């Protein structure tokens, strides 16, 4: 139970413990930063970054969402995605580019 | 209130939009506009009167 506690980024500090998914999810707030030119600069925006981390013998993902997003909704969505990834780690994904349709007419009958 | 109420990020209050194209039969005068709602600001269409 709870294997890795490394905090790869020093600028972000943990705010909740590594709650487990019945993977583990950890919420990290950000420490103080430099001055901003104006207060309407931190939460301004909608793009979300999903940063990938090197595999630690487990994989770590840094997902950052804008402020206005509800933390409960973000946590639930991330938990559902983690459960789906754990279950699935197919031909359906292969169908959606490198399988072709007309070339899939010699093999089925010949 | 002194915070989280106004932007102070150099944005305009009034905007003049000129039509991208106009066609006028001798019964009707049609004007087509495309209004860009900033990136973060919002407006209510109670404004935006045709001049």
């Amino acid at each position: 139970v709870v294997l890795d506690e490394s905090n790869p980024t020093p600028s972000y500090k943990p705010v909740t413990e590594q709650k487990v998914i019945l993977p583990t999810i950890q919420v990290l707030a950000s420490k103080k930063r430099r001055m901003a030119e104006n207060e309407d600069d931190r939460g301004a925006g909608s793009v979300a970054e999903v940063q990938m981390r090197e595999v630690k013998p487990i994989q770590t993902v840094d997902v950052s969402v804008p402020d206005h997003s509800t933390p409960m909704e973000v946590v639930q969505s991330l938990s559902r995605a983690a459960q789906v990834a754990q279950r699935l780690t197919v031909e359906a994904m292969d169908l959606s580019a490198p399988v072709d349709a007309k070339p899939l007419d010699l093999k089925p009958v010949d | 209130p002194t915070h989280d109420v106004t932007t102070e990020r150099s944005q305009r209050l009034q905007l003049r939009f000129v039509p991208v194209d106009r066609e006028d039969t001798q019964y009707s005068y049609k004007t087509r506009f495309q209004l860009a709602v900033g990136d973060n600001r919002v407006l209510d269409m109670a404004s935006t009167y045709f001049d």
């Binding site: 939460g43 402020d67 206005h68 | 209130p1 915070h3 989280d4 109420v5």
Partner: peptide, 20 residues
């Protein structure tokens, strides 16, 4: 965000106007 914008310090929502 911080509990929405502040109010001027010292039915709310919805309209039902009809009939004609």
């Amino acid at each position: 965000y911080n509990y929405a914008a502040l109010a001027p310090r010292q039915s709310g929502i919805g309209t039902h106007e009809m009939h004609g």
